[PDB]
Amino acid sequence: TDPAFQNLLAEFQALHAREPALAGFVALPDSLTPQPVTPVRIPPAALMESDPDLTTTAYAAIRDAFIAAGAVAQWRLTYQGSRLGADFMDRFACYCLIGEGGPFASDSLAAYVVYMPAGLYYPFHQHPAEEIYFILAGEAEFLMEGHPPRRLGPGDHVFHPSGHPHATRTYDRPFMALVLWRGDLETAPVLTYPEGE
């Protein structure tokens, strides 16, 4: 429906295809049932739209498209009643494209955008889905329990085994990423340390 979302999908489908780490993770079913989205705006959206420093190589289209459908997105508010403050809540940017709260439905995958501004810590978090982080724009640090950290640029990617604690920290750069889920799509991410860290 909303042509913002229309263009987005199409930018999704084509990158998926061009990118082995995506196409290797999940097959695109081709073949997604449309569903209405109730818009929710949050300040992070503003942030994403505004950020002058979401730099790329090969991934401007999708990026722009992510931005464009931002106006119509269901912005999420995961971590709501946690230990995380508005500091977090008003900076951490996420919406659904494929799945719950997104314009398209699927039993096989979900797809998302993550934005984070500079000077932010995304604390250690976890979920049942298997995960891929494909970076579109800027750069950030990726954290994963028991592995050395990785600085992630564009077209870089990280795999998250099930339940595996992972974190992100931005320094002076922002980033945007495509995030794909497979497996248990229904269980929302939770903080690994709801009281600490």
Report the alpha-carbon distance of residue 185 to residue 73 in Å, rounded: 19
183: left (phi over 0), alpha (psi -120 to 50) or beta: left
Which backbone phi and psi does 87 adopt, to 5 degrees?
-40, -45
Say if residue 130 carries a ligand binding annotation: no
Secondary element (H or E) of residue 59? none
User: Which residues, including other chains, have CB under 8 Å from residue 21's CB and lie 6 or more apart?
Assistant: 132, 134, 157
Say if residue 166 carries a ligand binding annotation: yes
Structure tokens at 146: 């028991």
Say if residue 131 carries a ligand binding annotation: yes
Q: Which of 195, 190, 191, 189 is nearest to 96 (CA)?
A: 189
Query: What CA–CA distances, in Å, run from 29 to 46, 55, 149?
Result: 32, 30, 33
Query: What CA–CA distances, in Å, run from 141 to 135, 151, 152?
Result: 11, 5, 6
Q: Which of 75, 110, 103 is nearest to 91 (CA)?
A: 75
Binding residue positions: 127, 131, 133, 166
- Extract the annotated binding site for a divalent metal cation: 127, 131, 133, 166
